[PDB]
């Protein structure tokens, strides 16, 4: 839904991250059976300090890359109408990943130590410093992490209505303001679409069904029940293989969101699912030892700004500061996006 | 399609409300203004937020508008609409540094005490 | 309706511009900031939301 044309030029290259695996020489072995060992550990600890600095530079580089790709939601209002408006294209490593908050994501350049001996027959101070370094430095701190749409088929979002809709709005905004309308579509089958928590999609030029016009403007995917939604959605995913298998066709890994907690998501997709469908449906029926760590159908609940997954038992924290946005910010973004289309 | 889906803000008597509405883009405003008047406020022209109001003898397309723009319902100026003039500022640090200055405020009295 | 005539200046990293504005003041800033951006700018640094 736009009365103006957008043209896709070269994506602005992100800050260059690299995967140079840093190798660390093991601690010196203790005297095989004192200034000697003092100088030894002094040399090792200086080497360790500089390699600490180096790996911290690697981590800050990774984090700057991830923050270039996943900005804070409040920034998204400035993206549209810019050289970077829909930059991610299916060659990028950040395609179809939507930020869900800041969490400690492990390093992208795994540290290593040459495997010769890893016992405590080594220097106490040197080996202690190395173990501490390797224990903390695994992760970068508070980097924007996200959900990979391509490897998801049902994202059952347990939780309070307000916070659940906040997180879902954050994801849908983060997606639709980084992807073309020909590479990502959005559809919503909610009980009521007269309300600001989902009305904002009215402008979004990614809920429009291609080459149909119902009422004013091009016809939109917003509906009032899963049955009517699937009716309006069939000839845009009823040519697609099953979800796990691969396809060679160009296709939109579109989003479908079912605000209705009652609605069973089996009335849009099938049980194995479709390729390029992401059923982001909220419910309230909590699970209990329904063990499914499968990262293709995750059950994640938002509590007070912290999204928790259901891996194998108990709620395991997946993020720490779960991003969220209002209906107002989403309305503003949706307006600023309705000025461009290529569909 | 000759449609533009704009978000007109209402005549505030309870607060401004972004009533979204679709407007025929190729039609002169003399016919759609009474309609949108009926819509936004249950019962004179449109203007971009900071800009100058559009002429009643024009079309939304010609003055230029797109499906995401915000139009406020105002009344055309009695006299001629006048341009805004930009004052070139060559240093903002001094305005900020002197706006952070108060002559003998209660803070000075606290310091002296 | 209510309106208000306020003067704004962009500071930025370059010699900004002070201009008047006739802004309607009944609605959240998020709906009027892009208007100010269009006015006082002559229109990536890792862009930042401006208010």
Descriptive overview:
It is classed as transport protein. The entry lists the keywords ESX, secretion system, type VII secretion system, mycobacteria, complex, membrane protein, transport protein. The structure is cut from a larger assembly and holds 1 copy of chain A (343 residues) and 2 copies of chain B. In chain A, the strands form 4 sheets. In chain A, strands 5-9-10-11 form a 4-stranded mixed sheet, with helices on one face. Chain A has a 3-stranded parallel sheet with strand order 6-7-8, sandwiched between helices. A two-stranded parallel ribbon of chain A has the order 1-3. Chain A contains 6 helices and 11 strands. Chain A has a domain at 95-107 and 139-343. Chain A has 343 residues and is α/β, with parallel strands linked by helices. Chain B has 113 residues and is an alpha+beta fold. Chain B has a domain at 3-74: Ubiquitin-like (UB roll), CATH 3.10.20. Chain B has 4 helices and 5 strands, in the order ββαβαββαα. Chain B has a 4-stranded mixed sheet, with helices on one face. In chain B, strand 1 (3-9) and strand 2 form a beta hairpin. Chain B is elongated, with a radius of gyration of 22 Å. Chain A binds chain C through residues 12, 67-68, 71, 74-75, 77-79, 82-84, 328-329, 332, 336, and chain C through 28, 30-31, 33-34, 44, 46-50.
Name the largest protein-protein interface in this structure: B-C, 25 and 24 residues
Helix-residue proportion of chain B:
25-40%
The largest beta-sheet of chain B arranges its strands as: 2-1-4-3
Q: CATH fold name of the domain at 3-74 in chain B, please?
A: Ubiquitin-like (UB roll)
Helix and strand succession of chain A? EHEEHEEHEHHEEEEEH
* Shape designation of chain B: elongated
Question: Going across the major beta sheet of chain A, what is the strand order?
Answer: 5-9-10-11
Number of E-type strands of chain B:
5
Strand content of chain B: 15-25%
Radius of gyration of chain B: 22 Å
> What characterizes the major β-sheet of chain B?
4 strands, mixed
Helix percent band of chain A: 25-40%
Termini separation of chain A comes to 9 Å
GO cellular component, one term (chain B): plasma membrane
Keywords (chain B): Cell inner membrane, Cell membrane, Membrane, Transmembrane, Transmembrane helix, Transport
Main location (chain B): membrane
Function (chain B): Part of the ESX-3 specialized secretion system, which is required for siderophore-mediated iron acquisition and for the secretion of EsxH and EsxG.
